[PDB]
Design a protein around this ligand. Sequence first.
Ligand SMILES: Nc1nc2c(ncn2[C@@H]2O[C@H](COP(=O)(O)OP(=O)(O)O)[C@@H](O)[C@H]2O)c(=O)[nH]1
Ligand SMILES: Nc1nc2c(ncn2[C@@H]2O[C@H](COP(=O)(O)OP(=O)(O)O)[C@@H](O)[C@H]2O)c(=O)[nH]1
Ligand SMILES: [Mg+2]
Lengths: 160, 81, 285, 301, 90
Amino acid sequence: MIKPKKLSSLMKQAVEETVPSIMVFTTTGSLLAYVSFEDPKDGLKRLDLAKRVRSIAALAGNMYSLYTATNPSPLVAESTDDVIAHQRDVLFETIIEFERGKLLIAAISIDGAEDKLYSKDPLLLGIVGTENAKEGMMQIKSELLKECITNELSTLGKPV
Amino acid sequence: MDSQLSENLLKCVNETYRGAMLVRNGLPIATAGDVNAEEQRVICEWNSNAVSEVLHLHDSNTKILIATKESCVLGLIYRNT
Amino acid sequence: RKIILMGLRRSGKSSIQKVVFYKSVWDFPGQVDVFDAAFDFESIFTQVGALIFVIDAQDDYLDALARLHVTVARVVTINPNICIEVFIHKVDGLSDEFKIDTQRDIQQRTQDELADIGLENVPISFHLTSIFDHSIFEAFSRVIQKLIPQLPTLENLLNIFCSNSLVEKAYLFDVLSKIYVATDSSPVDVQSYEICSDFIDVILDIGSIYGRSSQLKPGHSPEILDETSSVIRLSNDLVLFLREMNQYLALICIVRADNFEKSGLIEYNVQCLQTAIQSIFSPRT
Amino acid sequence: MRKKVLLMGRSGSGKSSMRSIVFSNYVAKDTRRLGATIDIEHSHVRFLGNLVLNLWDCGGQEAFMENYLSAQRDHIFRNVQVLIYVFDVESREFERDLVTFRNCLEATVANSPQARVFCLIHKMDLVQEDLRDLVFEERKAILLETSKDLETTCLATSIWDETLFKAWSAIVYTLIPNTPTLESHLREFAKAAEAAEVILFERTTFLVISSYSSESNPATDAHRFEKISNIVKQFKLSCSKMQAQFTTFELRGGNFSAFIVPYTEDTYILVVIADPEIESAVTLMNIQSARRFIEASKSAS
Amino acid sequence: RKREEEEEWESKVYDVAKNKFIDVFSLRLRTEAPQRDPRDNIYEEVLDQIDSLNLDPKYDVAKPTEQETEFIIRKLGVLIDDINNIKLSD
Ligand SMILES: Nc1nc2c(ncn2[C@@H]2O[C@H](COP(=O)(O)OP(=O)(O)O)[C@@H](O)[C@H]2O)c(=O)[nH]1
Ligand SMILES: Nc1nc2c(ncn2[C@@H]2O[C@H](COP(=O)(O)OP(=O)(O)O)[C@@H](O)[C@H]2O)c(=O)[nH]1
Ligand SMILES: [Mg+2]
């Protein structure tokens, strides 16, 4: 069992002014949990924010799934074929820069089991930035949120 | 941004070094002072074998103090005049 | 504008309003017609754009056809913008060979006497209705599509939405009456339409059972509720999904589960179609 | 595991209509073409895997049921789990029905003293609505006076509403063993997944096997389970018209979210979340976590 | 006189919703395709013959004094310790 309030409390402490929204979704764009910088009080102010976050996750899951079928690892580091045999790589970070924001898509390598609570779709951590945001701090926040979510989801397979 | 990194970056900037620039091997992490009108991309794209360098543009008059170890680069912005 | 359900006695009009209307539709009786001055017929027929005549297939209909022809002549002499539709009714007990021959006989008997009268400019449609089937809902939907002046814009929107999102079939239902306002250019299967009609029944019944907290608050809801969205996956590699468009409208689409792996893009196109529909149906200048 | 269920009653009380609607996937309008039942129609129903229900659809005529109490007394009333006697409320011979019900009760006590009696007072839709309660309590005061020999509950049934599924769910709830284990499983699943209401159905008949409603349940209707059973049976018939099998249902209401997914090989589970902040994709694999847990439990066992 | 303005409004909102859609069918793997235009490559050399910009990264090197080098190597170590001293919970 996954508690989305636990994930919202875990992602609420990694949110600053330059990082408005942090969300966790699947590769098909299905949103699991998300946070925000300012908490809305109006109902419609929550609804349009949820629709925007759902659209961002829906586009970002397909933008991750376009790049997951490409292996550029043999096209670097000219060495022996055993090294190429050790290059079975999967995508784990993706940064997209815009004029009025930044987007970071990082795949959460869930522990416990290879078929614990996902059917060949890794959970993706989406970090939304702004113009004044810095991409290197977003990578540190992404690796901290990944190593905390993986330890949080290591106790999955909850019974009855 | 943490508070101790913010006060350390405020300790980076002074009346001599008017701009502080913290950056990884390829991505920025922290800025202070006047970091604008280029003078950030040249710090991000910078790479050399040695560890202590002083660089200024030949079409400008801004001198940058650059150190690089453990995949972390610190840039200090001050005018050459 | 109103919808007038004409016909004769024992034609099936009251059963039509029991099935469709009782789960502006007006039922004139099978007697005291336009020759009688019991009602202001010229005042009503100016404000009425759709005229429906119910014809029994099993019973003799030549007197019904003469009454239909004099009613068409009356409403054309009242206003030239009325739409005339013919509802061939009580086809549940008829065989498959009987329906085509009855439709051919009724259409050949009607469209030649239309030329014999001389009012060849007006279009008269023909529909095969039965209260025990869903063909009465489809016939009333095709009647309602003529009255809406915004049908080609919604039809082109549904066409480009079905072409862009790989959606096999789309309808724009009204949830209270199970009558679809618009559909795409592909034909309407009866097997698709039955499950699309009962999808609204399942959604409305479960939302009536469990939508008790807030929902029907008398003053106002303190929080704005989400739109009702549903997804049903079937075993024959087909997915049905609904999204609530307006306070009375919904969009049921049929999509293969191969194409529902990219359901986020279909959700984005559904949101853009929601914006288009809510901007079309808003009051403007 | 075989359970023997007797379905007795007067002539034309509607026993074959209930058997066809609940178990043989009929509708209410198709039971008008049902013929008379000659002697006993034995039915074997696979209900929840290893449990098999032996339904003895006995004929309600007088020459059949004089033969039931005289010659076939050892064949019928021995090893009876649940005796269902059906009472027509529109019958003009209720005093004649009471003597025959007493004879069937005496035969059931003399042959199988550990059995449960269900008195289904059928055809309640023929009674006007405001008289539909105090008439039924008029009969319920009589039969509970009559049936002091065994455990007896009287239920008002009709095939034109939701009371039939309530009565047959109450009948088959006693036949299912270890129901506190399933109730504790549903309680722990609703506590773990933060669900307001968890209802477990059967796959074919869609009878409510078990349910658990928390204090945060938005539904206030006391007859909601059989209504939802009628909804999913009507949609299963709608899918069977298209020659397709309904697998998953997902809903996102204004303040709720209902999910109908298969739980075991013979069950369907309805999970209702009262929190709109919980997304569909969290709950749709929160159910799959418990499904993988019970699959790992049933693989070893 | 007013229906044509409504028709123009519906035409422009149809154009808006047509431009706002996503072509899902174009968003697939159309790869493993033969080449189409392998000949039009001489435009690359005739445009990038010189084009006045083939210029290396400049960063014109002066030599650091030991005071500023000591200052920045003392500052970079404690900033690296600040980087690895980060934590999610406060
Ligand atoms: N079995 C069957 N009966 C029908 C059908 N359509 C109409 N009827 C019957 O025909 C009768 C027609 O009555 P109707 O003309 O509507 O009454 P009026 O509106 O007052 O003139 C109804 O009472 C229905 O019972 C049908 O499709 N099937
Ligand atoms: N109105 C009403 N009619 C019923 C009900 N149950 C059964 N019937 C009708 O009564 C008849 C009973 O026939 P049947 O089930 O074969 O009686 P059995 O021989 O005792 O099993 C059926 O044709 C049904 O149409 C009910 O609850 N309400
Ligand atoms: Mg029978």
